[PDB]
From a paper:
In summary, WDR binders from a previous hit-discovery campaign for EED have been screened and optimized using NMR, computer-aided drug design (CADD), biophysics and structure activity relationship (SAR) approach. The inlet with the cartoon depiction of [name] highlights the location of the binding site in the [name] domain of [name]. Shown in the remaining part is detailed view of selected amino acids interacting with the compound. 293T cell lysate incubation with these (**16**)-beads and comparison to beads in competition with (**16**) to block specific compound interacting protein complexes from binding, enabled the discovery of the whole core CRL4^[name]^ complex including CUL4A/B, DDB1, DDA1 and RBX1 ([Fig fig1] and Supplementary Table 2). Interestingly, neither EED whose early scaffolds led to the discovery of cpd (**13**) nor any other WDR containing protein (besides DDB1, a known [name] interactor) showed significant depletion >50% from beads, proving high-specificity of our [name] binding scaffold.
[name] is an essential [name] repeat (WDR) domain containing E3 ligase receptor of the Cullin RING ligase (CRL) 4 subfamily, and using two different [name] prototypes, one directed towards the nuclear protein BRD9 and the other towards tyrosine kinases, we demonstrate utility of [name] for targeted protein degradation.
Author numbering: 1080 to 1315, 1327 to 1390
The structure:
Amino acid sequence: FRPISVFREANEDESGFTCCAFSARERFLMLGTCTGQLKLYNVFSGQEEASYNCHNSAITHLEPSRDGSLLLTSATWSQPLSALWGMKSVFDMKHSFTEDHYVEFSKHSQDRVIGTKGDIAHIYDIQTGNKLLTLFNPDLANNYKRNCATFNPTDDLVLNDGVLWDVRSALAIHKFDKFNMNISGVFHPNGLEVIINTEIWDLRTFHLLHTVPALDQCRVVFNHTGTVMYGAMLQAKSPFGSSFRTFNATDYKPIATIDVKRNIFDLCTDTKDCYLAVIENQGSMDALNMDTVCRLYEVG
Ligand SMILES: CC(=O)N1CCN(c2ccc3c(NCCN)nc(C4(c5ccc(Cl)cc5)CCCCC4)nc3c2)CC1
Ligand SMILES: CC(=O)N1CCN(c2ccc3c(NCCN)nc(C4(c5ccc(Cl)cc5)CCCCC4)nc3c2)CC1
């Protein structure tokens, strides 16, 4: 991990980056802010290139479509809470997800959005904005406090609140046992494994393949090649602490623990997996304003 760049939000007494994701274009990071702005930055110079007010509360999440034409945002305390924006020609809102605190694109063909509202998953059509499905079963719910519903790599399975759903049949296939209070889990990019906190489950057998203690209370993200998995741990103002963990995605063997000594808001990689961008808070929770920086590392 060689530090390559650092910048803060342009012209602010206090810097309000809350989340990031690379665009299509390679040198250009997208960042959310505590004032609900979406901003485009040159990741090397720290130059602010553009600015849009998406919400009147802080941004928690953003996701660009692979084709560069669409963006998902989620906010903290806004109605609507999440939205889908078009980025071809004119930046404009296409649809809004009134009470979904989290949204993602479908993964194989990006024609759908999945939203989370507490313990409930919603799937929408991107073209119409219509709600196609509601995935919830009160008898099977885990009530994870940081539930985030997600599609698998082929878009035909969903994980919501520790329940595996078949999308075609809208049937719950399997409820995974509850072993923690917060983390609901993600699919491995290989399409065969599910990672729920410290447990790695085989999707074909539901056997336990690995325990990874260092993953406790981590939000897990994969690089674009699916070779490396990155975790930041929930704190006991940011949702994360000051360290991130990397693991070999194939054998789950720890690669590195990096303590940046500042609470982390987000991290992401470019599509070529050369760079890791981390949002780090220089201020404490108790500060009047936030004071985040975006730090860019070359991976080593
Ligand atoms: C030299 C070079 O490659 N560059 C040089 C700098 N670039 C720039 C410079 C200005 C941009 C701009 N503003 C021009 C007038 N509002 N708008 C947008 C769009 C946009 C994206 C995000 C946000 Cl938050 C607000 C607007 C995305 C594409 C079309 C719809 C607006 N993208 C730009 C990219 C990116 C790449
Ligand atoms: C009140 C306020 O202004 N703030 C300032 C803004 N805060 C922030 C800033 C960054 C966040 C973040 N980044 C990483 C992803 N982009 N992820 C998440 C979510 C999250 C958190 C923990 C876990 Cl295990 C699972 C999910 C995931 C996205 C939606 C909501 C919960 N929450 C954030 C809230 C919340 C408090």
